[PDB]
DNA sequence: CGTGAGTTATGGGTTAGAGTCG
């Protein structure tokens, strides 16, 4: 059906801050969480890879990688934590169930939203005292600020 | 450093137009 093809990395080493000034950080080895940080060196740094679709998608599709690693952000289902998936190289071709690696990246001003290609009404979301999850919206926080050049 | 008339559209350059590329 729909196929996604990797173009290139379009953003290196950025930080995601939610609307509450909380940065995404590593929770353990599997998950991410969010926390208010004084020192942004504890914040995860991300790379963003752009994909084209085989059809005229409305919003650009991206993959999110933890910078200087082989760990890619992967969606599960609603209210479940995103998973860090280890991969030898960035996937050149994505279709079928592997679209859980991909997100539509939309901006509303300075606000950035990442919706699962596998679940287009679910967002990367932070929730107090819990891991970064897929969520439909409030009370979860779904709008992020992108802090660039944070290597 | 990235193709080949496509999703040609774009937040963007990748957007022209078959020819560079090592
Ligand atoms: Mg998580
Ligand atoms: Mg494609
Ligand atoms: Mg997804
Ligand atoms: Mg989001
Ligand atoms: Na489009």
Author numbering: 9 to 159
Q: How is this structure described in the published paper?
A:
As a member of the cytokine interleukin 1(IL-1) family, IL-1α plays a central role in the regulation of the mammalian immune response, with accumulating evidence implicating it in cardiovascular disease, systemic sclerosis, cancer, and other conditions. As a member of the β-trefoil protein family, IL-1α adopts a secondary structure that is composed almost entirely of β-strands with one α-helix. The core of the structure is a six-stranded β-barrel and another six β-strands form three hairpins that serve as the bottom of the barrel. Unlike the other two IL-1 family cytokines, IL-1β and IL-1Ra, which contain 12 β-strands, IL-1α has an additional β-strand at the N-terminus that forms hydrogen bonds with strand S5 and the long loop L8-9, respectively, further stabilizing the whole protein structure.
